Amino acid sequence: GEFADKLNEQKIAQLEEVKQASIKQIQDAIDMEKSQQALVQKRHYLFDVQRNNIAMALEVTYRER
Amino acid sequence: GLVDDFEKKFNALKVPIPEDKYTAQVDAEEKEDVKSCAEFLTQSKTRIQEYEKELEKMRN
Fold first, then answer.
1. Residues in contact with B40: Cβ distance below 8 Å, sequence separation at least 6, in sequence order
2. How many angstroms away from the CA of A8 is the closest CA of chain B?
3. Any idea where this protein resides (chain A)?
4. Residue B48's closest chain A neighbor by CA?
5. What is the DSSP string of B18-40?
6. By Cβ atoms counted within 10 A, which residue in A43, A61, B17, B23 is the most buried?
7. Cβ(B51)–Cβ(A22) under 8 Å?
8. Do B40 and A35 touch (CB under 8 A)?
9. Residue B1 in 3-state DSSP?
10. What is the C-alpha to C-alpha distance for residues A27 and A5, in angstroms, rounded to an integer?
11. How many CB atoms lie within 10 A of CB A25?
12. Contact B58/A18 with Cβ under 8 angstroms?
């Protein structure tokens, strides 16, 4: 009788870790993708701020002259 | 003709626009693409692959 219960509870326990892993991994495929998307567009802006800053600073300078 | 002298001199005096000797950023950018861009993205993709491969197995 017990033969089943231990095995069964074993068998469930498994798919319980299986569903778990599975969520946790796909959440990670997810994070990775956000990391990427960010490094994409995202990062250029830093340099864009910088280039913009220059452009302005020359204009102000020209005008001031 | 001080004024005449000046009006003339004023006009057709061309004030220099400042050299943009400052876009070394373009460079510091292209650099951080060696860095951020390729390197990270390449590894992230590879990790996403294995994860996917790891979900593969688990489907069976």
1. A35, A36, A39
2. 19
3. Mitochondrion; Mitochondrion inner membrane
4. A29
5. PP---TTHHHHHHHHIIIIIIII
6. A43
7. no
8. yes
9. coil
10. 32
11. 16
12. yes
Task: Compute the distance between CA of residue B56 and CA of residue B60 in angstroms, rounded to an integer.
Answer: 7
CA distances from A28 to A16, B26, B30 (A): 18, 33, 29
Secondary structure class of B60 (helix, strand, coil): coil
Q: CB neighbours of A36 closer than 8 A, spacing ≥ 6?
A: B40, B41, B44, B45
B23:A36 CB<8 A: no
Q: Which helix (H) or strand (E) holds B41?
A: helix B41-58
Residue with tokens 């993709």: B45
Backbone angles phi, psi at B11, to 5 degrees: -60, 155
How close, in Å, is residue B29 to chain A by CA atoms?
6
Q: How many CB atoms lie within 10 A of CB B51?
A: 16
